[PDB]
Design a protein around this nucleic acid. Structure first.
Ligand SMILES: [Mg+2]
Length: 106
DNA sequence: ATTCTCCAACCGCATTTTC
DNA sequence: CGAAAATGCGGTTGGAGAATT
Protein backbone atom coordinates (compact mmCIF):
# COMPACT_ATOMS: atom_id res chain seq x y z
CA UNK A 1 0.00 0.00 0.00
CA UNK A 2 2.69 2.48 -1.11
CA UNK A 3 0.05 4.38 -3.16
CA UNK A 4 -1.27 7.64 -1.72
CA UNK A 5 -5.06 7.90 -1.18
CA UNK A 6 -7.36 10.90 -0.72
CA UNK A 7 -7.33 14.54 -1.82
CA UNK A 8 -5.07 15.51 -4.74
CA UNK A 9 -2.61 18.28 -3.95
CA UNK A 10 -1.78 21.01 -6.48
CA UNK A 11 1.72 19.47 -6.73
CA UNK A 12 0.16 16.16 -7.78
CA UNK A 13 -2.25 17.87 -10.18
CA UNK A 14 0.63 19.61 -11.99
CA UNK A 15 2.47 16.31 -12.55
CA UNK A 16 -0.70 14.61 -13.88
CA UNK A 17 -1.59 17.59 -16.11
CA UNK A 18 1.96 17.81 -17.56
CA UNK A 19 1.95 14.06 -18.31
CA UNK A 20 -1.47 14.11 -20.00
CA UNK A 21 -0.49 17.22 -22.04
CA UNK A 22 2.78 15.62 -23.12
CA UNK A 23 1.56 12.03 -23.76
CA UNK A 24 -2.26 12.11 -24.03
CA UNK A 25 -4.99 10.36 -22.06
CA UNK A 26 -5.00 6.67 -21.12
CA UNK A 27 -2.41 4.08 -20.08
CA UNK A 28 -3.09 5.52 -16.68
CA UNK A 29 -1.08 2.79 -14.93
CA UNK A 30 2.13 4.07 -16.60
CA UNK A 31 2.01 7.52 -14.93
CA UNK A 32 3.25 6.50 -11.47
CA UNK A 33 6.08 4.54 -13.11
CA UNK A 34 7.10 7.43 -15.42
CA UNK A 35 6.71 10.23 -12.82
CA UNK A 36 7.22 10.85 -9.10
CA UNK A 37 3.45 10.49 -8.56
CA UNK A 38 2.35 7.90 -5.98
CA UNK A 39 -1.04 7.31 -7.58
CA UNK A 40 -2.53 4.25 -9.31
CA UNK A 41 -3.99 4.56 -12.82
CA UNK A 42 -7.47 4.31 -11.44
CA UNK A 43 -6.94 7.35 -9.24
CA UNK A 44 -5.22 9.33 -12.05
CA UNK A 45 -7.96 8.55 -14.55
CA UNK A 46 -10.60 9.81 -12.09
CA UNK A 47 -8.79 13.06 -11.21
CA UNK A 48 -8.25 13.85 -14.90
CA UNK A 49 -11.83 13.12 -15.97
CA UNK A 50 -13.55 14.95 -13.10
CA UNK A 51 -11.27 17.96 -12.39
CA UNK A 52 -8.31 18.51 -14.74
CA UNK A 53 -10.10 17.95 -18.08
CA UNK A 54 -10.78 21.23 -19.95
CA UNK A 55 -14.26 19.91 -20.89
CA UNK A 56 -15.72 19.87 -17.33
CA UNK A 57 -17.94 22.77 -16.24
CA UNK A 58 -16.95 24.57 -13.03
CA UNK A 59 -20.10 26.47 -12.01
CA UNK A 60 -22.94 25.28 -9.84
CA UNK A 61 -25.70 23.33 -11.53
CA UNK A 62 -28.20 25.65 -13.21
CA UNK A 63 -31.98 25.27 -12.87
CA UNK A 64 -32.00 24.07 -16.51
CA UNK A 65 -29.41 21.36 -15.72
CA UNK A 66 -31.46 20.33 -12.65
CA UNK A 67 -34.62 19.86 -14.74
CA UNK A 68 -32.71 17.93 -17.44
CA UNK A 69 -31.23 15.60 -14.78
CA UNK A 70 -34.59 14.99 -13.06
CA UNK A 71 -36.08 13.98 -16.45
CA UNK A 72 -33.10 11.91 -17.55
CA UNK A 73 -33.22 10.12 -14.18
CA UNK A 74 -36.95 9.43 -14.60
CA UNK A 75 -36.21 8.01 -18.06
CA UNK A 76 -33.05 6.08 -17.12
CA UNK A 77 -32.80 5.40 -13.35
CA UNK A 78 -29.37 5.34 -11.62
CA UNK A 79 -27.38 5.04 -14.88
CA UNK A 80 -25.14 8.03 -14.26
CA UNK A 81 -22.72 7.69 -17.22
CA UNK A 82 -25.72 7.31 -19.52
CA UNK A 83 -27.33 10.38 -17.94
CA UNK A 84 -24.08 12.40 -18.01
CA UNK A 85 -23.72 11.79 -21.79
CA UNK A 86 -26.70 14.15 -22.29
CA UNK A 87 -25.56 16.81 -19.77
CA UNK A 88 -22.85 18.88 -21.57
CA UNK A 89 -19.75 19.45 -19.43
CA UNK A 90 -20.91 17.32 -16.44
CA UNK A 91 -19.52 13.90 -15.55
CA UNK A 92 -21.31 10.84 -14.16
CA UNK A 93 -19.87 11.60 -10.71
CA UNK A 94 -21.08 15.22 -10.71
CA UNK A 95 -24.60 14.24 -11.80
CA UNK A 96 -24.73 11.42 -9.19
CA UNK A 97 -23.58 13.79 -6.42
CA UNK A 98 -26.10 16.46 -7.46
CA UNK A 99 -28.86 13.85 -7.38
CA UNK A 100 -27.83 12.35 -4.01
CA UNK A 101 -27.28 15.64 -2.15
CA UNK A 102 -29.77 18.06 -3.77
CA UNK A 103 -32.54 16.07 -5.56
CA UNK A 104 -32.86 12.82 -3.55
CA UNK A 105 -33.78 15.05 -0.56
CA UNK A 106 -37.00 15.96 -2.44
C1' DA B 1 -15.11 24.32 21.22
C1' DT B 2 -18.31 20.78 18.63
C1' DT B 3 -21.78 19.15 15.01
C1' DC B 4 -23.09 19.34 10.40
C1' DT B 5 -22.97 19.32 5.31
C1' DC B 6 -21.52 17.88 1.07
C1' DC B 7 -18.75 16.00 -2.40
C1' DA B 8 -14.08 14.16 -4.06
C1' DA B 9 -12.44 10.03 -4.23
C1' DC B 10 -12.48 5.50 -2.51
C1' DC B 11 -14.21 0.40 -2.72
C1' DG B 12 -15.85 -3.80 -4.79
C1' DC B 13 -17.11 -5.73 -8.78
C1' DA B 14 -17.80 -6.61 -13.95
C1' DT B 15 -16.10 -5.90 -18.31
C1' DT B 16 -12.37 -5.14 -21.50
C1' DT B 17 -7.49 -5.46 -22.92
C1' DT B 18 -2.93 -7.21 -22.91
C1' DC B 19 0.44 -10.47 -24.21
C1' DC C 1 -5.31 -19.56 -25.12
C1' DG C 2 -6.35 -17.35 -20.49
C1' DA C 3 -4.30 -15.10 -16.27
C1' DA C 4 -3.27 -10.80 -15.00
C1' DA C 5 -3.77 -5.98 -15.71
C1' DA C 6 -6.25 -2.21 -16.91
C1' DT C 7 -10.66 0.32 -17.54
C1' DG C 8 -15.18 1.90 -16.17
C1' DC C 9 -19.15 1.95 -13.27
C1' DG C 10 -22.26 2.96 -9.19
C1' DG C 11 -22.69 2.89 -4.11
C1' DT C 12 -20.54 4.73 -0.29
C1' DT C 13 -18.14 7.75 3.09
C1' DG C 14 -13.82 10.47 5.23
C1' DG C 15 -12.84 14.68 6.24
C1' DA C 16 -12.28 19.80 4.78
C1' DG C 17 -14.66 23.70 5.49
C1' DA C 18 -19.08 25.71 7.05
C1' DA C 19 -22.22 26.17 10.50
C1' DT C 20 -23.82 25.93 15.19
C1' DT C 21 -23.47 25.92 20.49
MG1 LIG D 1 -21.51 15.00 -19.67
Amino acid sequence: NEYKKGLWTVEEDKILMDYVKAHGKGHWNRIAKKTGLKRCGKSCRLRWMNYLSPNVKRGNFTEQEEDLIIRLHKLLGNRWSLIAKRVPGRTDNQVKNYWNTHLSKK
